[PDB]
Write a protein that binds this DNA or RNA. Structure first.
Lengths: 107, 93, 83, 98, 93, 106, 79, 98
DNA sequence: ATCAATATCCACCTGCAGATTCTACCAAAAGTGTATTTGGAAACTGCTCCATCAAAAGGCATGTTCAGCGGAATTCCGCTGAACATGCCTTTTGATGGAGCAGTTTCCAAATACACTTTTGGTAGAATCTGCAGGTGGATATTGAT
DNA sequence: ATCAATATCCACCTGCAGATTCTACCAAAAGTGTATTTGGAAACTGCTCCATCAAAAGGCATGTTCAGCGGAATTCCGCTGAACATGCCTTTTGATGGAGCAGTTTCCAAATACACTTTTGGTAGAATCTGCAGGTGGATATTGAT
């Protein structure tokens, strides 16, 4: 008895995604491909961000990803930043960035 | 009991970075991320279906829904993993 | 067993600190009261909707999720006090 | 006199605070502000400790991002001192009263 | 058929300003408006159910949802109109 | 057979609103108290705009409302303007307004 | 080229409606680029709805729906 | 030898156009752009006449409001002439930029 | 203050594109009545977690002093937009094939609804594991005075 | 530009709160397997209405001339801020009574699910009506030169 996720090459629970799709009432019926496709996309997007997070955590000599890292990853990546342009990551701070005209000295 | 995608995110975390962890605070955020992205797509897909007088959201709705919601290249590599998990599922029966 | 006059607890020092995270270098002296004013309005809108979700569930305890759903309604999705 | 010129302690703070995440508003006083404002909406309320934390995280995030747009707005008038009219322009343009 | 609120917009239009009319493009705007407010109120009433794990979108929800969506006075009077119409219905055969 | 709309005392289709609610996939069950209320709420709001748009036209010596009149009525009321803050009414123009610091030196 | 179709005098009329008194010269090209980005974004989603319904004809509704999924809702074209 | 001073005609135009609702960009030119841009998303498309129009109404409706903010931006820097940096500013703060 | 060129208003006029009115057809509603089903209110209550009092202490706010320097006020003028009248190249308007947008029919792959069987992801809880906060000190800048 | 006062960087070090690791129960999931229902792709087609063309219409592209806007240089007043002394009130480690959220079981008022009938809001072709959009005329307010 193989899980549907394994049938599709995924890690994310197609079984779950599918169930949620129904209790959410997005429609009368739900394809059998929908759950797979979705789960696949979810899994991909969480792998993209984790990749960047992991990296951000490496640059700060840490082994365990914390809020701040998920933020550094998102805000430093053009697209992700757009996809989450109205999202607010708790305990994430902001990108270091001081306007040019505020720096001392000249030249 | 409250479900969370926590174990799944973890599995994937180990795939990209075998030697990296993630605090429970970060995991929570990831959880809000999977969930937030989920609703967003299903939603857009809900609307796509009514706009066309349709009763079942299929992988085709989900996709367009994903091309309208995500940005450039992200749409593209999402659409591929999409198509690819389906095509594989579809031959497993 | 007391009262209420809270937006002075929003100290000058704290408002400085937030201006810094914003990349601010020099602050006018009238910023402090203007900020306080802005913050209040903001809190009022969220708490207003927050408490609405509370009442509507016939509860007497504003939950994390209430604030979250309220924060979503106002285009400020907050990540993580529970999806 | 070993005294830093004005503008040198500022940049030091800017860098400092942008490097960290911890909340900038004294917790307790923020909590009373929440109970004060909420109470005048509906009395006899109780807040989960986590509810209040979210309202902070969210308020601080807002304000922080509000200053950036403000700061951008003063720099536009050729200044470095943010003034009320700056906060006011950003709020207008933003659709918070435009 | 292509339903629309045209015709109920005209019956109201006449109780307010009997002698007043309305061009085509203007009736089109008022149809778009009744749909906007419909979908908006509907949706929030939908969520209001889901958050509270309820399968029923009753009058109660519509209320709470009109309270979240409409601006102060506007909601005060919309909440009443609504309670009036529901009361007049229950108390009837 | 004397109706749902007439029963609740409305001009808006209580039956149509109820059929739109079911078929929009907003929930598994739709109490009967929902469409009525909602219907009543939609009517009220529509009366509200027409009232103001009806006046707007009078003020311009016209008996027929057009886009132009719904806009001057919506952007001149504090509340509605907020409710339709991100809405664009086609062929509505903009309210007359010139920044003071742009008027003549006098 | 078509972007130059949106002519200076048109742009001048737009701004006016916005209550602009005096206009720099570069404004004209800056306005063009912004109009393009606007359009591309809108038409992209519009055309996507089209290709979902399987047609070769952008419809009023596809545009409306696009203009909606942004907080640019439009009244007066069905929906 | 009659000449109106700079701004006296502008001010009358503002009055003129805030009073009318007619479209200000010429339809043909505009329709070519709509078609030109779309050709890049999908080849050989057709537009419903009411589709291109909904498109114009929205585009100018959009542009107008932006000049409004751009103007407030110039006024903010103590000018009466709007400049590129004004637009850019109103867009950054709106969120359309960064 | 006195014209002189224009722009704006207003009162009246009337052709017509757009709105109102009457008739007739009918699929799709929407109302009605019967039968079956069930969501979630009510009553009881386990147990989590919120309100709150207590006490100690140092982080941090408050308030004053004093000088650095930013920002508004002012004068100056280089040069960029704006007003205007000249000339026609492009848009606007109305007539016409045909590409599709839809309206209808057919029918099968695919989505319910239903009965079981089995694998799994929560979690309550006792116990071991380990990344990194935060205290410490010293090498390396970064500033400001000279 | 060399000096002195300080803040910043940064690798080492260790108590510990937060985390990675179980053994065990499991209700809720997810998967397996007919039986029944049907949403929507697919092929064919009529009626739109969208693309294209040619003639009639009127907005735009262009070069001169100069008002005046707005950036630069200069000045100084007063605000904002760095430094410092003092001590409050926020922060922290705990503990306790109990409000009130939340799990469980009961049970009916209301919602679903057909089936049969009546009405009705939408569409289509034809006829008739009208609100007001432009056009004209003459008065007069607005703006610019002297």
């Amino acid at each position: 008895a193989k899980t549907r996720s394994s049938r599709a090459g995924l890690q994310f629970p197609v079984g779950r995604v599918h169930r949620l799709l129904r209790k959410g009432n997005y429609a009368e019926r739900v394809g059998a491909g929908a759950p797979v496709y979705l789960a696949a996309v979810l899994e991909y997007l969480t792998a993209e961000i984790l990749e960047l997070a992991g990296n951000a955590a490496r640059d700060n000599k840490k082994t365990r990803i914390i809020p701040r890292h998920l933020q550094l990853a998102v805000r430093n990546d053009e697209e992700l930043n757009k996809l989450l342009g109205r999202v607010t990551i708790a305990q994430g701070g902001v990108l270091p960035n001081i306007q040019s005209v505020l720096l001392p000295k000249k030249t | 009991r409250k479900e969370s995608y926590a174990i799944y995110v973890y599995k994937v975390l180990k795939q990209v970075h075998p030697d990296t962890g993630i605090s429970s605070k970060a995991m929570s955020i990831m959880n809000s991320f999977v969930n937030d992205v989920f609703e967003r797509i299903a939603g857009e897909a809900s609307r796509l279906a009514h706009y066309n007088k349709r009763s079942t959201i299929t992988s085709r709705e989900i996709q367009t829904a994903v091309r309208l919601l995500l940005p450039g290249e992200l749409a593209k590599h999402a659409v591929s993993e999409g198509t690819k998990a389906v095509t594989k599922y579809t031959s497993a029966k | 067993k007391v009262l209420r006059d809270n937006i002075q607890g929003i100290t000058k020092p704290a408002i400085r600190r937030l201006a810094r995270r914003g990349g601010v270098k020099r602050i006018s002296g009238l910023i402090y009261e203007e900020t306080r004013g802005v913050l209040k309005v903001f809190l009022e809108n969220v708490i207003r909707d927050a408490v609405t979700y509370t009442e509507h569930a016939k509860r007497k305890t504003v939950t994390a999720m209430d604030v979250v759903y309220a924060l979503k309604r106002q285009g400020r999705t907050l990540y993580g006090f529970g999806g | 006199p070993h005294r830093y010129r004005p503008g040198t302690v500022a940049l030091r703070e800017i860098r400092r605070y942008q490097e960290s995440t911890e909340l900038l508003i004294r917790k307790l006083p923020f909590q009373r502000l929440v109970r004060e404002i909420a109470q005048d909406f509906k009395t006899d309320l109780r807040f989960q400790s986590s509810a209040v934390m979210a309202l902070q995280e969210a308020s601080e995030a807002y304000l922080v991002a509000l200053f950036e747009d403000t700061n951008l707005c003063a720099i536009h008038a050729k200044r470095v001192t943010i003034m009320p009219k700056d906060i006011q322009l950003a709020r207008r343009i933003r659709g918070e009263r435009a």
